[PDB]
Amino acid sequence: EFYGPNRAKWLGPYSENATPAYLTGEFPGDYGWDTAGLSADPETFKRYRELELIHARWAMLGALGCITPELLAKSGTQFGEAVWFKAGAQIFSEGGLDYLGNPSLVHAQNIVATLAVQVILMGLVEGYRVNGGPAGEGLDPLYPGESFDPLGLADDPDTFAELKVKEIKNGRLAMFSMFGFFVQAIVTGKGPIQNLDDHLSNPTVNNAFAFATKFTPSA
Amino acid sequence: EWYGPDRPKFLGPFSEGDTPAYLTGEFPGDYGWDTAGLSADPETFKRYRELELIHARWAMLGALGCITPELLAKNGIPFGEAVWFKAGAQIFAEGGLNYLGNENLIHAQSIIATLAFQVVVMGLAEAYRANGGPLGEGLDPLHPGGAFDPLGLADDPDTFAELKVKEIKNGRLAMFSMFGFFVQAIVTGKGPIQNLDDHLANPTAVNAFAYATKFTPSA
Amino acid sequence: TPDSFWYGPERPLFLGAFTGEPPSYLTGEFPGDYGWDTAGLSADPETFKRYRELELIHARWAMLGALGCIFPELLGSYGVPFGEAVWFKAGAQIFQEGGLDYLGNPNLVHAQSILAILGTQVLLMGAIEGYRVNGGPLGEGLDKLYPGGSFDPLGLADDPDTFAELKVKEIKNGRLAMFSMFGFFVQAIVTGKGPLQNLSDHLANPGTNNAFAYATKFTPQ
Amino acid sequence: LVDERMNGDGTGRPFGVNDPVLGWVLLGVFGTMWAIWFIGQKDLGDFEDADDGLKL
Amino acid sequence: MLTLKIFVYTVVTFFVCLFIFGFLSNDPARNPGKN
Amino acid sequence: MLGLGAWLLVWKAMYFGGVYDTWAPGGGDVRVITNPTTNAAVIFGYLVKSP
Amino acid sequence: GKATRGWLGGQGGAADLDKWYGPDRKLFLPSGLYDRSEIPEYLNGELAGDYGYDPLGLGKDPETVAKYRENELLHARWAMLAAAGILIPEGLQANGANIKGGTWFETGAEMLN
Ligand code: CHL
Ligand code: CHL
Ligand code: CHL
Ligand code: CHL
Ligand SMILES: CCCCCCCCCCCCCCCCCC(=O)OC[C@H](CO[C@@H]1O[C@H](CO[C@H]2O[C@H](CO)[C@H](O)[C@H](O)[C@H]2O)[C@H](O)[C@H](O)[C@H]1O)OC(=O)CCCCCCCCCCCCCCCCC
Ligand code: CLA
Ligand code: CLA
Ligand SMILES: CC1=C[C@H](O)CC(C)(C)[C@H]1/C=C/C(C)=C/C=C/C(C)=C/C=C/C=C(C)/C=C/C=C(C)/C=C/C1=C(C)C[C@H](O)CC1(C)C
């Protein structure tokens, strides 16, 4: 499965007729779901796959990155701020920004120098991803190869065509979960692990319906 | 009239100087307004007609259900606070959520029961709308007929091709009026009949320009 | 097409040397083609035409909007007695007791009714946007977005090289304004002040009147 | 206050301007003379070239 | 006296701008020499 | 080379003992310049001032 | 094989081998003090680090020089870690990371008994 006609699909068994023609099943993650009809052009459908995988890979680093400064707070490690969305504002703090509870670490103080180094560093590696760089030029734009896969996992192409499906399914789970983290923090105001503890405290009373009457027009 | 290359259009006399060549007149509701060029692909234009028609049907169900708890409120029907954009919070009242005013009616307190019932009902029902099933399979995805035309009205193919235009024109301003009701509740904060009562009290003074300086950013 | 440095395969690109090669349908014969359609919205040549009048009219409104939002605000700081000089607080001048006096001068326009302003705006903007689509007394069969003729009175779009050069200047001055007019919206929601009042404060202390002093403004609370 | 004056000699105002009409006089005359020069640049030779000055 | 000060600034910056935009207008090729 | 040479005077006035400040209270004295006036309207006010 | 790309520009690979190898290469003195006839003939531009710097004629022929390359390269690579091994714990000792013995010469005296 996961390729060809008898792959898994987005309505399970009730999905043999909603699948369009162009979503055949030779790409990874191809469950045949274009209800909005957006990818009827293969020159355009090639471009959204470029966007989806990169959004998938930034979200997998976004999910774990928003979690580990709060799980390590549950191990008692002092951070100055452990909540993910309040984490950026502590370069304005008096001690500044230490990488853990260690003022002998990075000890950042100036926000504008931290941003300006990012524009040069991220600006040049995102340009290498497009055209080419020190780690190779004429490669696959999404699965480039050897310097980013040192461990040789991209061999035996039946495994390699299967690890891609592991990559996108883990990835689509992350983008869905990161869209969680914004909403559950813009509504509640607390962290995700903290709001997990609020639900595991009393699940019947701690749901989104406890905040359902929040955004009402008070006029 | 209503079809062919002599249908009425969305600017009238000015409209004939810019109308898209891929819009011909072979579908109901063609007034030649695709200036953004979004439906130039005939495959996507197949899908956008399906997205338009379903949105219209929930709007025609929606727009009628937003005012019937308010017209009955001025005809002496005992409701518990029947205004559509805050009637969802009636389930957290202490008497459950009785339907008209009467406790021997539905009397729903646990929203977890009525939610999970809905997603199983609407899960199979929306799944059957795409693939088919117990109310026919091999039918048109927009107008199946038969089980959904019991009253025989979808005959006389010179009349059925004109009830479509009545289906979508009545459908379009219902979509335009639910986009009405949303904004007139965000800004004002009262039911649309209460807005319509207040506009008729003084149309020169009480209109939308009284609320024009509401969202000025005080900082 | 001549050697004009902006049209053709040697044209400059939106990432410089790191662009590589543009998409296969952006071949460099339309103004402002730096080859940036990474999301590929306009692969259909029927659809790609539809974004260009959609871009150019947005430019020709934003360039009026960029000058129009600051020029009463600039003169307001030099003693011209406006009702309000700030662009997003100038729409509510119809509700004050003196009416909307143009230039702050009571013997000018002196508008009173907001309905009369809007009643004659639609009856005019309907006709001239109607004339822009087709017809109209100033030209019958012309281009949809470079009509010329009575819309080029000074006659400075006649040579096919100079006119192909000034189309590049129009869209780049346009794309400068649309990006900047987007900036007026965000730094008025955030800062709450007029846009030069934001400028005269950043020139006061640049280290502390930057945008990061407003970074904790929308904290969930 | 037996009379009215500029009172603006020791003030050190920039370019000597004290009324903001002077800044528009300083700038508006400048832009007009620039505008006539920029239009008439078409006659002054086109040195869009590698090296085309009064060289030696 | 303000009416006089706004007039001198129009006069001076007229003639100062004929100077600056005069020497820019390819003066080093306004010579009788040949090449 | 004279951009960097300007900074040597800046570094010696903020880190390396400072310079002789004759407007010190109670006679002139060496003061480390801690808060240099870097306002553009203050700095460029000297250049377009009359002589 | 490795079709690569330059860091800033648009072309990778070797910048210039002729800047460092062969007859024309950087030397320990410029051209005005040291011409190409004063080069010892057992130093030709075919190894790295060949600035021709050998006033004391310790090397004789490139076979003898090659075993001193073993003494040169191995003394290099153990020293390069030592410079990081000395400076890095002392700064962490300075900022607040308690090494208790980050300073390099009295490190062993901290761990005796
Ligand atoms: C046969 C049963 C079956 C059904 C009914 C579905 C249905 C669905 N699958 Mg599928 N699947 C099913 C079997 C299977 N799926 C999959 C694998 C997948 C994948 C990988 C994915 C899906 C997805 C989807 C969704 C696509 C449509 C959608 O996004 O709706 C969205 C719209 C609604 C659900 C309706 C609106 C929400 C809510 C119910 C309304 C309630 C309103 C709120 C209370 C308040 C409103 C807020 C206001 C106030 C502001 C849909 C929920 C996609 C998905 O997960 O999308 C997120 C998707 O990525 N399925 C497998 C494994 C092979 C199946 C095995 O049998
Ligand atoms: C001959 C004159 C004539 C004119 C001027 C129009 C114009 C229009 N028709 Mg058409 N029609 C005309 C003849 C006819 N129409 C139709 C049938 C239809 C239909 C079915 C539809 C239209 C629609 C439209 C609209 C589509 C263009 C648009 O989207 O505007 C976009 C531009 C504007 C709206 C400009 C804004 C004007 C206004 C002054 C804005 C006010 C600004 C705010 C006060 C401040 C801003 C708020 C900020 C704070 C966020 C437009 C209003 C469509 C529609 O209803 O869309 C809503 C539509 O569905 N027409 C028929 C029957 C055949 C006609 C007869 O000749
Ligand atoms: C051309 C577009 C247009 C825009 C962007 C605005 C915007 C505004 N008007 Mg205005 N108007 C516009 C046209 C017109 N207005 C008026 C008459 C008035 C009056 C009487 C008043 C305003 C007021 C306002 C301000 C509301 C304060 C605010 O939004 O908070 C800050 C937030 C922002 C500035 C962000 C706004 C950006 C915008 C939402 C996104 C831009 C895209 C729009 C959706 C496009 C809309 C065009 C459509 C209608 C075709 C706001 C600046 C009120 C005011 O003066 O405020 C004190 C007010 O009292 N307008 C007329 C005559 C009928 C117009 C003609 O078209
Ligand atoms: C402005 C105040 C400021 C100061 C005083 C420091 C100083 C420090 N930084 Mg930090 N940083 C500061 C802000 C910032 N840093 C960084 C990014 C980093 C990185 C990537 C690293 C540091 C490291 C360090 C620590 C050196 C550790 C060591 O023992 O030396 C060992 C190093 C040497 C012996 C050689 C370098 C000597 C010198 C200490 C330079 C290191 C400092 C920074 C690179 C920037 C220089 C700041 C100036 C004002 C002293 C030390 C606490 C290092 C660290 O985290 O080690 C635990 C390190 O790797 N900082 C950014 C983002 C650009 C900042 C902006 O606000
Ligand atoms: C208390 C405060 C008081 C403040 C007082 C104000 C003081 C201001 C001091 C400013 C001092 C600057 C003086 C030096 C300017 C030098 C300009 C120049 O050498 O200029 C040389 C260049 C030449 O430009 C080139 O000109 C070329 C000309 O080509 C033409 O000519 C070519 C051959 O000549 C070919 O023939 C070709 O076909 C043809 O098109 C092309 O156009 C090029 O694209 C173009 O880059 O000009 C340019 O880049 C000029 C770029 C800068 C322009 C600045 C304009 C500023 C305007 C401010 C607002 C004024 C408002 C005015 C309103 C008026 C109405 C009231
Ligand atoms: C996209 C374009 C745009 C838009 C929509 C606006 C919108 C607005 N501007 Mg702005 N503006 C813009 C561009 C724009 N501006 C630009 C580019 C400039 C620079 C020239 C200005 C300069 C400007 C000033 C200086 C002022 C405005 C003002 C206004 C407001 C009212 C406009 C008005 O009174 O019209 C009426 C104007 C006209 C109908 C045209 C001018 C007519 C004058 C009065 C001469 C009259 C002609 C003749 C002598 C009399 C007829 C004969 C008679 C005797 C019978 C409104 C918010 C006013 C305000 O309060 O904002 C803060 C204001 O004072 N605008
Ligand atoms: C204006 C300064 C200047 C310039 C442009 C040059 C340029 C040159 N020199 Mg000359 N030279 C200079 C000063 C200068 N020199 C001085 C001051 C001395 C006396 C030490 C010499 C002695 C000298 C000799 C003897 C020779 C050259 C040679 C050369 C050529 C380059 C080869 C080379 O690396 O230089 C060689 C010189 C050095 C590598 C000196 C080291 C330079 C240090 C590392 C730079 C320090 C810069 C620092 C910021 C300055 C401090 C600030 C302040 C004191 C100003 C080139 C034509 C060679 C040549 O032409 O070949 C025939 C050559 O044989 N130069
Ligand atoms: C498919 C389809 C089909 C049909 O046809 C149509 C439709 C329906 C339309 C479609 C759908 C779609 C969708 C659903 C989408 C979504 C997406 C997403 C959500 C993404 C995210 C995405 C997301 C993402 C990236 C994210 C990322 C993140 C990150 C990095 C983070 C970072 C961070 C961290 C670490 C921490 C600190 O403290 C801070 C921060 C900074 C915060």
Q: At B133, which amino acid appears?
A: G
Q: How far is B19 from chain C (nearest CA, A)?
A: 10
β-pair partners for F31: F19
Burial of B56 (0-12, 13-18, 19+ CB in 10 A): buried
The angle at the Cα of B194, spanning B192 to B196, to the nearest 5 degrees, equals 70
Q: Is residue B4 part of a domain?
A: no
G87, G89, G93, G94 alpha-carbon torsion, rounded to 10°: 30
Q: Is residue A88 part of a domain?
A: yes
Structure tokens given for C121: 């705006």
Burial C39-63 (b: 16+ CB within 10 A, else e): ebebbbeebbebebbebbebbeebb
Q: Is residue C6 part of a domain?
A: no
Q: Which residue of G has its CA nearest to A123?
A: G8
Q: How far is the CA of C102 from the centre of ligand 6 (A)?
A: 7
Q: Is residue C38 part of a domain?
A: yes
Structure tokens given for B112: 């977890």
β-pair partners for F21: F29
| 3-state SS class at D21 | helix
Q: At B19, which amino acid appears?
A: T
* Cβ-contact G53, G59 below 8 angstroms: no
Could you tell me the end-to-end alpha-carbon distance of chain A, in angstroms, rounded to an integer? 55
The pocket around ligand 1, CB under 6 angstroms, is made up of A 8-12, 14, 31; B 119, 123, 127
* Cβ-contact E8, D23 below 8 angstroms: no
A95, A100, A102, A106 alpha-carbon torsion, rounded to 10°: -70
Q: How far is the CA of D53 from the centre of ligand 2 (A)?
A: 59
| 3-state SS class at D35 | helix
Q: Is residue A4 part of a domain?
A: no
Which of C63, C65, C68 is CA-nearest to residue C174? C63
Q: At what angle do helices C195-202 and C45-76 cross, to 10 degrees?
A: 70
Q: How far apart are CA G19 and CA G26, in angstroms?
A: 7
Q: Which residue of C has its CA nearest to D23?
A: C78
Q: Is residue C51 part of a domain?
A: yes
Q: How far apart are CA B60 and CA G77, in angstroms?
A: 79
- Taking residue G107's Cβ as centre, other Cβ atoms within 10 Å add up to 15
* Cβ-contact G7, A133 below 8 angstroms: yes
- Residue E23 φ then ψ, to 5°: -75, -20
Q: How far apart are CA A162 and CA A169, in angstroms?
A: 11
- Taking residue B79's Cβ as centre, other Cβ atoms within 10 Å add up to 16
Q: How far apart are CA C104 and CA C92, in angstroms?
A: 14
Q: How far apart are CA D16 and CA C218, in angstroms?
A: 45
- Residue C33 φ then ψ, to 5°: -85, 90
Q: Is the CB of A65 under 6 A from ligand 8?
A: yes
Structure tokens given for A15: 């999905």
**Touching subunits for chain F (3+ Cβ pairs under 8 A):** C, D
Q: At what angle do helices A157-187 and A192-201 cross, to 10 degrees?
A: 70
| Range of the structural domain that residue C51 is part of | 13-215
E strand or H helix at F29: strand F29-31
Q: Is residue B156 part of a domain?
A: yes
* Cβ-contact E29, D52 below 8 angstroms: no
Q: Is the CB of A55 under 6 A from ligand 8?
A: yes
Please report residues of C whose CB lies closer than 8 A to that of F41.
203-204
Q: How far is A219 from chain B (nearest CA, A)?
A: 5
Q: How far is the CA of B111 from the centre of ligand 5 (A)?
A: 70
Q: How far apart are CA C142 and CA G65, in angstroms?
A: 84
Please report the DSSP string for G25-81 in residue order: ---SS-TTT--SSSS-TT--SSSTT-----SS----SHHHHHHHHHHHHHHHHHHHH
Q: At B157, which amino acid appears?
A: P
Considering only CA atoms, which residue is closest to atom 28 of ligand 6?
Answer: C102
The angle at the Cα of B83, spanning B80 to B84, to the nearest 5 degrees, equals 120
Contacts of A195 (CB under 8 A, 6+ apart): A184, A185, A188
Q: Which atom of ligand 3 is nearest to the CA of C91?
A: 55
Q: How far apart are CA B80 and CA B77, in angstroms?
A: 10
Structure tokens given for C118: 């809007």
Contacts of C202 (CB under 8 A, 6+ apart): C209, C210
Q: At B171, which amino acid appears?
A: G
Structure tokens given for C6: 């902006």
Q: How far is B20 from chain A (nearest CA, A)?
A: 19
Q: Is A14 annotated as a binding residue?
A: no
Number of H helices, E strands in chain B: 5, 0
| 3-state SS class at B110 | coil
Considering only CA atoms, which residue is closest to atom 18 of ligand 1?
Answer: A10
SS3 per residue for chain C: CCCCCCCCCCCCCCCHHHCCCCCCCCCCCCCCCCCCCCCCCCCCHHHHHHHHHHHHHHHHHHHHHHHHHHHHHHHHCCCCCCCCCCHHHCHHHHCCCCCECHHHCCCCCCECCHHHHHHHHHHHHHHHHHHHHCCCCCCCCCCCCCCCHHHCCCCCCCCCCHHHHHHHHHHHHHHHHHHHHHHHHHHHHCCCCCHHHHHHHHCCCCCCCCHHHHCCCCCCC
β-pair partners for F30: F20
**C130 → closest Cβ in B14, B40, B216:** B14
Considering only CA atoms, which residue is closest to atom 25 of ligand 5?
Answer: D38
| 3-state SS class at B133 | strand
Q: How far apart are CA A196 and CA D21, in angstroms?
A: 65
Asked if the Cβ–Cβ distance from C92 to B213 is below 8 Å, we say yes
β-pair partners for A136: A133
B52, B55, B61, B64 alpha-carbon torsion, rounded to 10°: -80
Q: How far apart are CA B88 and CA B109, in angstroms?
A: 12
Query: Do chains F and G meet with 3 or more Cβ pairs nearer than 8 Å?
Result: no
Structure tokens given for A78: 């002092």
Structure tokens given for A63: 């999910």
G15: number of CA atoms within 13 Å, CB side?
5
| 3-state SS class at A177 | helix
Burial of G28 (0-12, 13-18, 19+ CB in 10 A): exposed
Largest CA distance in chain A: 64
Structure tokens given for B33: 């307004």
| 3-state SS class at G84 | helix
**B37 → closest Cβ in C46, C130, C217:** C46
Residues in chain F: 51
Instruction: Note the ligand closest to the C-alpha atom of B131.
Output: 1
- What's the domain count of chain D? 1
The angle at the Cα of C84, spanning C83 to C88, to the nearest 5 degrees, equals 145
Asked if the Cβ–Cβ distance from E10 to D25 is below 8 Å, we say yes
**A186 → closest Cβ in C39, C43, C220:** C220
Q: How far is the CA of A10 from the centre of ligand 1 (A)?
A: 8
Which of A142, A120, A122, A128 is CA-nearest to residue A49? A142
Q: At C41, which amino acid appears?
A: L
Q: Is the CB of C116 under 6 A from ligand 3?
A: no
* Cβ-contact A178, A59 below 8 angstroms: yes
Instruction: Give long-range contacts, CB 8 A cutoff, 24+ apart: D7-15.
Output: D12/F45, D12/F49, D12/F50, D14/F45, D14/F48, D14/F49, D15/F48
Instruction: Note the ligand closest to the C-alpha atom of C89.
Output: 3
Asked if the Cβ–Cβ distance from A135 to G96 is below 8 Å, we say no
- What's the domain count of chain A? 1
Q: How far apart are CA C171 and CA A166, in angstroms?
A: 45
**Phi-psi category of residue D34: left, alpha or beta, with phi > 0 → left and psi -120 to 50 → alpha:** alpha
Q: How far apart are CA B163 and CA B28, in angstroms?
A: 9
β-pair partners for F20: F30
Please report residues of A whose CB lies closer than 8 A to that of B86.
213, 216
* Cβ-contact C63, C177 below 8 angstroms: yes
Q: Is residue B71 part of a domain?
A: yes
Q: How far apart are CA A83 and CA C219, in angstroms?
A: 12
3-state helix, strand, coil in chain B (%, to 5): 50, 0, 50
E strand or H helix at F21: strand F19-21
Q: How far is the CA of A3 from the centre of ligand 4 (A)?
A: 51
* Cβ-contact C57, C173 below 8 angstroms: no
Q: How far is C26 from chain D (nearest CA, A)?
A: 28
Asked if the Cβ–Cβ distance from G5 to A102 is below 8 Å, we say no
Q: At what angle do helices A192-201 and A42-74 cross, to 10 degrees?
A: 70
- Relative to beta strand F19-21, strand F29-31 is antiparallel
Considering only CA atoms, which residue is closest to atom 10 of ligand 6?
Answer: C68
Which of B26, B33, B40, B27 is CA-nearest to residue B11? B33
Q: Is A188 annotated as a binding residue?
A: yes
* Cβ-contact A24, A30 below 8 angstroms: yes
Which of A81, A115, A73 is CA-nearest to residue A97? A81
